[model samples]
Target: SVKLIESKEAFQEALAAAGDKLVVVDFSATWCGPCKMIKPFFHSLCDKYSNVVLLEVDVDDCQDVAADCEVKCMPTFQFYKKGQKVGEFSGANKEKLEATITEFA
Candidate 1:
């Protein structure tokens, strides 16, 4: 399961704890239709990429985190490595999402 983050502190802690692991953050909203479509797929990544740290951040719940990440979309995906953002994309395209994971995983 992807870890659900509700606060900026927890978001920072998760990234810090991840260390060298690939961290995938799904910035979403409860009312976002696209987010709902890709949620299961995002969770599925947890099982496939055991070494990757999967995090779910609801923009409404963690405004600080969202603002810090500069999330401007409903379902933005951010990839981090060694505590730095390595890549980012928006939307729910399953193939592109999986491919991007493959690149950094």
Candidate 2:
């Protein structure tokens, strides 16, 4: 199942438990139209790549996480491998998103 993290503690815990798997942290807001549009696609990607862990962090609720990650935009995707961020992307481009996931997955 996909992980929905709301607090810094949960985020940290998820990172710690990630092990060698690729963790995709999606920073989004419920109020953002693009976020809603791409959410289904995100779920599809998660289902397609079972080895990759998907975690959603609401920008509004998890402001500290957003600030820590320097997320200047909504619907930002950060890819982490072994607790280290290796890739990232912003915006709602499905092709680019899939390509990024393919690169890591």
Candidate 3:
């Protein structure tokens, strides 16, 4: 099964555990329609790229994490490698999302 994290502590743990692998931190909220739209694609990408770690942080539930990550928008996806940020994207488009993931991979 895939991992779905919520707390800031879990978010930090996920980053630390990522090591050299890529980490995708999805910052979203339940009230966001676009966030809901792209949720499944995120899951699919996570399944496809088993080497990477996918983490979900709800801005409403994990305010500290959202602030630490400097999340400026709902449904923002932050990419990290070796515990450092590399890339990021926002929105619900499958093509753009896939491209963002491919760019890192």
Candidate 4:
């Protein structure tokens, strides 16, 4: 499931506790058009990837997480493993998103 991140502390805790699983954090805003466009696809990924931890951070609501991730745009996908940032991408490209997620799996 795509868990909605509510605070910086929870974000930190999730990253730390993810263990061997991939932590997929989607940094987005409610008002972003592209963010809205890709949400369904992101959710589908949550259902598809059973081995990954899916998290959605609304940048407007979670400023601390946005700052920690240095997110300059909406719909940013940040990949973390074992509490360390592994990779990232901006925008809502479906192919790239799935391919990257599959790469980690």
Candidate 5:
């Protein structure tokens, strides 16, 4: 399962600890229908890729983190590596999500 982030500090901590690994952050919200639908698929990816860092940040729970990341959509996917953002996409297309992961992973 992707760890749920609750604060900006915790989000930074996770990024710090990620090192050179690919960090995939799911910036979502509780009321987001698409977010709910893709959660299981995201969790499945967590199990499929052990080297990637999977994290879930709820906009309502961690508004600061969401604002800092500049997430404008309900289910924004951000990919980070070497402590910098490499790719980002919105919505819940399963195939595209996996393809993005594969491109970076």
Candidate 6:
């Protein structure tokens, strides 16, 4: 499932431990319209990609996390694998999202 990330630092830890698996975290906020637009698709990803580890963070709720990830947009998607940050995307593109999932997960 695409779980809600509560800790500011646990994410980093997860990435470090997730070898051969992708840790995908979406940094989003309640007031961001674009975030809202992509919310459902993010949920769908959890069920679609059983090989991926999905996570979500609310920027307002976790400023520390947002800053750690250098979140420049509300719907920023950070991709990490084997404890290293692989890439990122900052929008609501379903095709791109799925394409990314296919690559990592």
The count of residue-pair clashes in candidate 4 stands at 0
lDDT (Cα, tens digit) per residue for candidate 4, span 7-93: 888888888778889989899999999999999999998677889999999988878878878999879999988888889999989
Candidate 4 lDDT score relative to the true structure: 0.88
List candidate 2 segments past 4 Å from native.
Answer: none
The TM-score obtained by model 4 is: 0.93
> Best-fitting candidate, measured by lDDT?
1
Return the lDDT, model 1, position 43.
Answer: 87
**Can you give the lDDT of residue 2 in candidate 1?**
86
Residue-level lDDT tens digits of model 2 in 1-105: 668898878988898898888899889999999899999888887568878889999988878888899898878999998888899989988888888988997
Give the range where candidate 1 is weakest over 10 consecutive residues by summed lDDT: 41-50
lDDT accuracy of residue 7 in candidate 3: 78
lDDT for model 3, on a 0 to 1 scale?
Answer: 0.81
Candidate 3 regions exceeding 4 Å error are none
Query: TM-score of each candidate?
Result: 0.94, 0.93, 0.89, 0.93, 0.94, 0.89
Task: Rank by TM-score, highest first.
Answer: 1, 5, 4, 2, 6, 3
Model 6: per-residue lDDT, tens digit, 1-105? Answer: 677876756776666666689888889998899999999999888688877888899988888878777889769998888877788999988899989878877
lDDT at 56 for candidate 4?
Answer: 94
| lDDT tens digits by residue: candidate 5, 1-105 | 688889977877898999989999999987999999998899898778889999999899877788889899869999998778999999989988989999998
TM-score of 6: 0.89
Q: How high is the CA lDDT of each candidate model?
A: 0.90, 0.87, 0.81, 0.88, 0.90, 0.83
RMSD of each: 1.0, 1.1, 1.5, 1.1, 1.0, 1.5
Clashing pairs in 6: none
Report how far off residue 80 is in candidate 6 (Å): 0.5
List candidate 4 segments past 4 Å from native.
Answer: none
Give one digit per residue, the lDDT tens place, for model 3 in 1-105: 346677767777888988888888778898999999888888888667878888888889878777888888779988898878999887777887777778896
Model 4: weakest 10-residue lDDT segment is 10-19
